Amino acid sequence: SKDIYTDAGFITCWYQTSIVVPAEVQNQSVILCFVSACNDFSVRLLRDSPFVRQTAFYQ
């Protein structure tokens, strides 16, 4: 959850150089990002997730 006592880090991507591209090629491109976990990843307490937002039953 969002709190103040435990903050993690701030990913920030930066141009080390620019993008040098030759002629008759488009200028702009697309970078993708993936995410996963390493060998020592863990979770501890169960709860309900804040994404379930229902009102009544599903008849």
Binding site: Y15, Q16, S18, I19, V21, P22, A23, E24
Partner: protein, 252 residues
């Protein structure tokens, strides 16, 4: 093959896919001061994790008509983290280096750079009997720039690409650790430069140890549809650092 090279130093890792090689100075790998060459007697501080890591300097552009760059390198890292702090609070400093220069270009581009690491590059002034200011030999991570003509400014370094500042023949400037970033094969250039000096441990503000010179020989020639802005990014990392003589802050 041996085009993919990785370098891990502390908490910063450079991975390149079109490198050339690693030029290890004059064959000698960086090392701490063995006590056959010991001069001072108090215990030095060797941080080894918060110091031996890659620090990124400023990035400069390379148009069709650019002439060169030079960085003094015990001075351009004056204010880059705890290397900068442990430069300030001490009196004698000894460290190796590891230069890496990023510069990329597509296959429809051409050109060639030259990355030479000249020790003790004492430069001549523009006028004959004028005192150079400190803010023209170096500007920290802000790069200086050669001028291809006969430069005639006041309190300024003699900017001429056909003299390399020292008055040497710039074609003969390849006796030092040099690599060629020809843009058709290579993505970067790596120079591992050990600490060459006549004294075992020297100060890091009064003395400019060496000068990294990037001088383009083959100009950045390309078509009328390609991307104009092709930057040059330089990132170095000290090695085997140690610091002698802790004192109060400042330099004067």
């Amino acid at each position: 093959s041996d085009r993919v090279r990785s370098i891990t130093l502390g908490n910063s890792t450079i991975t390149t896919q079109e490198s050339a090689n690693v030029v290890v100075g004059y064959g000698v790998w960086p090392d701490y001061l063995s006590d056959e060459e010991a001069t001072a007697e108090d215990q030095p501080t060797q941080p080894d994790v918060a110091t031996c890591r890659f620090y990124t300097l400023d990035s400069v552009s390379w148009m069709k008509e650019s002439q060169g760059w030079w960085w003094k390198f015990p001075d351009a890292l004056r204010d880059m983290g705890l290397f900068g702090q442990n430069m300030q609070y001490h009196y004698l400093g000894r460290s190796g280096y590891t230069i890496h220069v990023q510069c990329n270009a597509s296959k429809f581009h051409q050109g060639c750079l030259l990355v030479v690491c000249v020790p003790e590059a004492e430069m001549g002034a523009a006028n004959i009997n004028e005192k150079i200011n400190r803010e023209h030999l170096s500007n920290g991570e802000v790069a200086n720039t050669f001028s291809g003509t006969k430069s005639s400014n006041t309190n300024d370094v003699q900017q001429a690409v056909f003299n390399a500042g020292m008055g040497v023949a710039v074609g003969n400037l390849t006796i030092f650790p040099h690599q060629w970033i020809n843009l058709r094969t290579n993505n970067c250039a790596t120079i591992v430069m050990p600490y060459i000096n006549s004294v075992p441990m020297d100060n890091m503000f009064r003395h400019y140890n060496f000068t990294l010179m990037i001088i383009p020989f083959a100009k950045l020639d390309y078509a009328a549809g390609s991307s104009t802005y092709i930057p040059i990014t330089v990132t170095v990392a000290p090695m085997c650092a140690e610091y002698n003589g802790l004192r109060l802050a400042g330099h004067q």
